[PDB]
Amino acid sequence: KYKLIVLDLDGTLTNSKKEISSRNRETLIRIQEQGIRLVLASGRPTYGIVPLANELRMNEFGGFILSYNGGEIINWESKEMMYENVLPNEVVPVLYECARTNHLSILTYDGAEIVTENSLDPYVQKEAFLNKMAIRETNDFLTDITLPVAKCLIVGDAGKLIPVESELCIRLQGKINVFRSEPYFLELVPQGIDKALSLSVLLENIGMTREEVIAIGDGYNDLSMIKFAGMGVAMGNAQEPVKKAADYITLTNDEDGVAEAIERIFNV
C-alpha cells in the first residue's frame, strides 16, 4: 500500500532540542531498509536539512529532500536536482528596500553561508544556529550575494514583521510567495511554491500516487500536504485545524510521534 513517507522537521521529526531521537532514527532507518522511501520537507535551506538526511542514511535508501518550502527537490542518493525554483532577481531589491525602511534584517543563502547586513541581529543568529550555517556579513547585500537565490528571509519581532508582510503582499502583486513560518521569520520564496505542490511534482516524476503517501507535520505550512497525502498525520503538538484535517493524530514530537505513527502503520 504505502510506499513513501514525507516528514516536516521542526515540531515533527525533531524534538524540542532540535535533535532526532534514537527511536525515531532507528525506526526510520528500518522502514527505509524495508523499502519505504523517505522525504524530508521543510522551509529550511538545503544545507540545514543535510545533516538530518545523512543521519537517516537517506543517501543509501533513495530518499529525497524538499527544501526551501518545496522550491528545491533533490534525490539524496544520486544528488540529482529534480525541481529547482528561484526568486525573480528583480524582486530582491524590493525585499531589501522594505527591510531597510522598516529597520529589519534581511538574509539569504549562498552555498554554505547565510548572507546579511547584520550578523548581530539575534533573529539572524537564530536561523544560523538552527541550520548550522556560518554568517557572512556584508555592507552591500545586493552586490555580495550570488543570484539567483532560492529564498530570502526578513526577520524580526512579529509586531514589526507583520506590517512588512502586509506591505510586500500588496506591492509584489503575487509575483512571489510571502508568508511567515515562525512568527519572527518572513519567508520570501517563488510563486506557487509549497510542500504539497512540490510533493505532487515529486510523485509525478517517480510514478507514485498520493494514495501511496504518508505525510506527517504540525504547522499550518503542513496543512496542504497532510490533506494531499493518502494518510495525513498531525503531530500531537499540531495546530487544531491541522489536527482536524488529518486522518490520524499522533503523539508530540517530544513523544516520538513520528515513530509511534509509523509503527502502527507498518511492521518494523
Q: Which residues bind Mg ion (CB under 5 A)?
A: 8, 10-11, 218-219
Backbone angles phi, psi at 173, to 5 degrees: 55, 30
Cα Dmax for the chain = 56
Distance of CA 180 to the CA centre of its chain: 12
CB of residue 217 to Mg ion, shortest distance in Å: 6
Q: Is 8 known as a binding-site position?
A: yes
Distance CA(244)–CA(107), nearest Å, equals 35
Helical segments of 66-222, H only: 92-101, 122-131, 141-144, 158-171, 195-206
C-alpha cell at 198: 512540490
Residue 40 or residue 74: which is nearer to Mg ion going by CB?
40
Distance CA(15)–CA(255), nearest Å, equals 8
Residue 70 or residue 219: which is nearer to Mg ion going by CB?
219
Q: Is 247 known as a binding-site position?
A: no
CB of residue 125 to Mg ion, shortest distance in Å: 20
CB of residue 43 to Mg ion, shortest distance in Å: 8
CB of residue 14 to Mg ion, shortest distance in Å: 9
Residue 40 or residue 178: which is nearer to Mg ion going by CB?
40
- In the bound complex, which residue of the shown chain has the CB atom lying closest to Mg ion? 11
Q: Is 222 known as a binding-site position?
A: yes
Q: Which residues make up each annotated binding site?
A: 8, 10, 218, 222
Q: Which residues make up each annotated binding site for Mg(2+)?
A: 8, 10, 218, 222
